[PDB]
Symmetry: D2
Subunit: 423 residues, 4 copies
């Protein structure tokens, strides 16, 4: 059910060495920078980006870096990453890539300065892939009347590793497929299990290597030492990105980094505290049941202590929304191992249902446990619409429905500013 190589979403931009696979993401901690990325195939080309605002018209030049990789018998094109900085808040910019031979032009809109009551709309996509179901989801997100401004991506991008020798041409087609969205607004990248690409059978043993070459993130801005975990702030949201498939024992980099990062969170500057990871801590589907238990034993209590608002995960090819629960009182011999209602706790949302290679996960644990509010095996995407410091509106759109229909929808009440029960 994967879209064939000659499909229109995979068409190659014309002209000698025309930039392709253009994508952007937030380039700094607070919103005043952007990482511009693209691939040229005919020759290395230039790493310069030319950009200007609608307001100023003044054209400046940023210069970045070019890298390549091989994977088994595949040889990549020339990958460019360039960071434009010191931009102005709430402003439309133009930028151009391919300055040596074939120039292409795009644009983006910076976010507002971070603040307590700054509204903002986030799209939620996981496990996208490049099947036909993938294409419908992206169309539905594009036509959403709520107008997403940034995508939080919860992992599993191209599913290129399902192909023989992980055929990396399928990374390239995915790069051209998603451009019509991610060249114009930032997507925030989370690493999933399909990015690992651990294949000693063909002497490819560097974890995450193709993903890490193609998708860069601003991980030093939060003083992280790896791209696989980091945070950013945008409008009124503090977003914490975690890596299910890196080390998180006591004393490791990721564990040490998270414990320090939660202490920097300021709820009167960014009241919406959002965590992303690939593998769900709370999951009542049969597929991948209880895989999140390990990370859950390390981090769940931290999430409650700091009153995290919501945790988004993918990995399960379906949709689920948890009640506000915690399961943090167990001590081996006390028998306290059942989740309980907890108004300091986040809501757990699984949203890894954007299409993958065309398969849904429909088997569920019966009966639905108390901790599960809503679950359904349908393709689609989510929208997390922040109105202000007390209220945010979440809605789930199905591919079989109209682009304006919401099959699930709920108001989030802020854990710090308005911790009402929101069942």
């Amino acid at each position: 059910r994967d879209m064939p190589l000659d499909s229109d979403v995979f068409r190659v931009p014309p002209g000698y060495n025309a930039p392709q696979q253009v994508h952007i993401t937030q380039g700094d901690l607070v919103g005043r920078a952007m990482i511009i990325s693209w691939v040229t195939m005919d020759e290395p080309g230039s790493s310069a980006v030319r950009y200007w605002s609608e307001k100023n018209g003044r054209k400046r030049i940023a210069k970045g870096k070019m890298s390549t990789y091989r994977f088994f018998n595949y040889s990549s094109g020339f990958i460019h990453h360039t960071t434009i900085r010191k931009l102005k808040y709430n402003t439309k910019y133009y930028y151009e890539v391919g300055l040596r031979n074939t120039t292409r032009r795009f644009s983006f809109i910076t976010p507002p300065q971070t603040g307590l009551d700054v509204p903002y709309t986030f799209g939620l996509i996981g496990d996208l892939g490049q099947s036909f179901d993938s294409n419908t989801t992206l169309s539905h997100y594009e036509l959403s009347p709520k107008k997403g401004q940034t995508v939080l991506f919860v992992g599993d991008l191209s599913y290129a590793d399902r192909y023989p020798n992980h055929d990396n041409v399928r990374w390239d087609t995915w790069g051209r497929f998603t451009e019509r969205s991610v060249a114009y607004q930032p997507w925030i990248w989370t690493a999933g299990n399909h990015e690992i690409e651990f294949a000693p059978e063909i002497n490819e043993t560097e974890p995450f290597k193709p993903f890490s070459y193609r998708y860069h993130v601003p991980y030093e801005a939060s003083q992280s030492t790896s791209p696989f975990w980091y945070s950013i702030k945008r409008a009124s949201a503090h977003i914490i990105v975690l890596s299910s498939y890196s080390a998180y024992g006591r004393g490791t980099p990721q564990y040490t980094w998270l414990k320090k990062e939660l202490r920097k969170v300021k709820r009167s500057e960014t009241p919406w505290l959002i965590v992303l990871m690939h593998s769900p801590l709370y999951n009542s589907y049969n597929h991948h049941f209880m895989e999140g238990e390990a990370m859950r034993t390390k981090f769940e209590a931290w999430f409650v202590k700091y009153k995290v608002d919501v945790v988004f995960a993918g990995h399960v090819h379906a949709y689920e929304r948890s009640e506000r629960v915690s399961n943090i009182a167990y001590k081996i011999t006390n028998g306290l191992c059942t989740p309980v209602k907890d108004q300091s706790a986040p809501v757990y949302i699984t949203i890894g249902d954007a299409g993958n290679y065309g398969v849904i996960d429909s088997n569920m644990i019966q009966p639905q446990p108390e901790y599960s509010a809503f679950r359904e095996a349908s393709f689609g995407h989510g929208m997390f619409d922040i109105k202000n410091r007390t209220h945010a509106h979440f809605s789930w759109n199905r591919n079989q429905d109209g682009v304006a229909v919401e099959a699930d929808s709920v108001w989030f009440f802020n854990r710090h500013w308005y911790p009402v029960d929101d069942s």
Copy 2:
């Protein structure tokens, strides 16, 4: 601070120009016919060649290895040598010499017998050794033990150098000179503890395990691991699996992938004793680090029960603990089944992190003793796991405050694959 001062006898430098120091050895292949020979020269790079011969044939041979150096903050290492001797005869005494160019030092070892069903072998068990005065006593009790251990299973936390300002790596060098009087003559099987992480971004040192990994090499490619921090070796009648508590082990990760495949390769008709080393215990009823093992346990415990692992050795708690054979693999979030139960199909869990560290014992325990815990005591000591044949092994625990020959705890193991009768 009960650390031995820098001018202690155990820290003396071997005299002579560019005299090799910190000499240590470990198994260098899958099945016992190779040895990794390691040492440090401090005056100049020197030769990485090892001269060696068997007592049986007396033919001097030469093996060439590699030299490396590292830096950590404002410390610069000496010249680190690693050399693999190969194609050794089983059950044979060998001599070896390092420092062939200026000052030469000679040592010896004995290869194991070939892997087989009823091949006896005595493994020492040492965890969280350190370089305090208690560490020296433990080491003396081991080398003086009438059971005579042939190989040390080391469950992590080596030098404790990371407790010093800037992780003063001089305390790695001292520890190497202290342990030489044992590890130069018999292999130690290295596990990576949390004191080896040395993650210190405040001084721009962000590569985990860097000092440990430059100084202590392991034969990880022989079991097709891709990392020195998990791997497998076979010796006599044992299959030893080494794990990394502070690497990734999520489903799909390198370590998870390797362990799933490796348990399937275990041939209990060749090595009947399946033994797992890791730093952080899965079962532990002391207050200190209580439940830090929960994460790894949810990932790997059902596998250990499935493949009838005989015993799991851990450290990290500074004390001794021996569990019953228990499991806790029936939990399903909402079914309330979360109390360990007796399970004669499960390994024994032993904590043996009490060789000395920096002079501090972990004496606070959860009371009353839980049903899963068989024996526990807060005393310094070491362990011995003495294989007799395919069905019987004998474990003993020796306390620093007893005579070298006094066993304070001891128990017979009945092999989970060849003889699974209640040994509780």
Copy 3:
């Protein structure tokens, strides 16, 4: 453009999934007991293992090598294998196979005799081969020669890939497949010429010799050299020194220092024939590249006369020339002694860069012929240096326009150490 087109037969891809191509061997040690097996696989990395066994005995062994890859501008290479077979027996035919995982191909070679005073041996001389039609004829003439070459001495300028846009490295791949029919069966000894430099900052390739050095390894550590671009080998009764015209050679440089110590190690009582290979000729009365060899001459000529080198072979000039034994080492800036004189202690200097290149011959000569030049002609062809015993070696030049058994020029060398007698024509 007289370069052979891409679909020529000499460029045909060996059939079969991941079949090895561009197979070539060279001597892999100082004395002749080793051989470096090199080849490229185009579909996936494959195995670096070489299976090999001797024709008479036949116990099959495996040797394991290494694989590497490189990029040049927007060209990406396939998978390059280099594998050293050691501890061979002298004067023995060996079989060997490559491609052990998927498509295997089998070849063979004959180890040299053990080094010794009177060991006969036959060396081909080829320079500036390229891949034109003229190139094909010369290689044809060499492989058909009655004298039966057992090793090619190659004085530099291999593929001429750098004449193509962006140095189209595909033209390295074809040249490998074209030369395979000789170099997979007998070692070629490699010298680095000015077309291997491939210095092209305009496309950000600033590492001299990158494609050449990835594809052709040499046993350079065996003579205590620190660079592949200069080294020494012994083979039968010859001691061969390979130098680098386009590397440093000032006093105190690595190459200078290495040649100095290497000339001391030469023992003419063990290997009587002392042979030097370099790309740019020290003595050259053709007009193309006239006097480029002067800088290296001022450094090394006196050393050649001192050590009584028998012969110096060079290329670069797309024609043939053979000098008289002469020297020019008495100049002191103001004493006026700047003319070459006859010197029975000096080597013969032979330019042999006429194997074909891209089809052009250098016919502009300085006139009249200088007294330092014995014979010269602007024709394509190749040479043979045919060693008989410790006193006699026969050099001959075969033209492409002649029968393969015809020598258009031919001279008997009398050994400078064992028969130090005037041997001029």
Copy 4:
């Protein structure tokens, strides 16, 4: 052995925890608007940031650089810093501070005037300095010169550390601390000499120039060179070309290709003084190293005469010599033209390698003095190249055994392009 012992005053270590030592500066760009600031910290890495401000305005700014280390045999370097200050103002005195994190130290320099046809400027000429007692005298004589030199052209052989056992690299550190009293306040232009090669395969140091290149950076990319060992700069009314006696220079090599194109760039109406620096002299009538420079001469002498180089400076020979204006470029093997002739498009060749090395002079001279030799003497000292304007520059030679204001040799240079009078 007349080298200064380790406890000499000139080798004292700046006091205080991790105080910068071995501070040295050089030109950081092509035209004079930038400066490379270099120093060593011995107790811990420290910061590579430099603080600098003009004496005029005084707006303080920070430039960030790069720390590196090396090993040589059993030696382990300290922490070496290189930091480029850019966009400086012409003809302006600046202050700079290094060591910001712990012990700070403060120095100053004066940027040159803008390049131009008639800018005056005074260059000191020092060669083969080393660290003998004679070395200390020459550096005193240069510092005290009434001519007041503003930038040193250093023609190679720096520390002579390679004469010690295993090239005791401590002797680089001592030399660094000794020369600091001049080179921290005004730039020195580095040329590589044979004592910088440090090729010692018998202790597996086989990378040519390794300690030298770590310790002394040059702005080589600003002239499109691919190597630090050949490069060019412009300062005031001079165009300075630095060449590498012990790198490759055959036809088609990188340095050959660079020099050929670089000479095509010189413009004598912007910079009328065309100066070439190299270590091994092309004209030398002393016995030590006689005719060592023939090889480079066969490749480059004709180019020097074709582009009318004013003066060529070299060292290597521990003495002084000034040549007549001659060339020896007509030789064609059989035509017999091998004697040098007066040539008024040729440069003057000056050997200035007599600053002290380790205390030995080269006194054995070829007799009688050849015609191409104007003046020669075997005594320690230094030179001065004092440019008055586009037609005139004045060269003088000061000997260590004279007062700091006596010139034992002296001559006017008439510019080859603007005023080619027989001199």
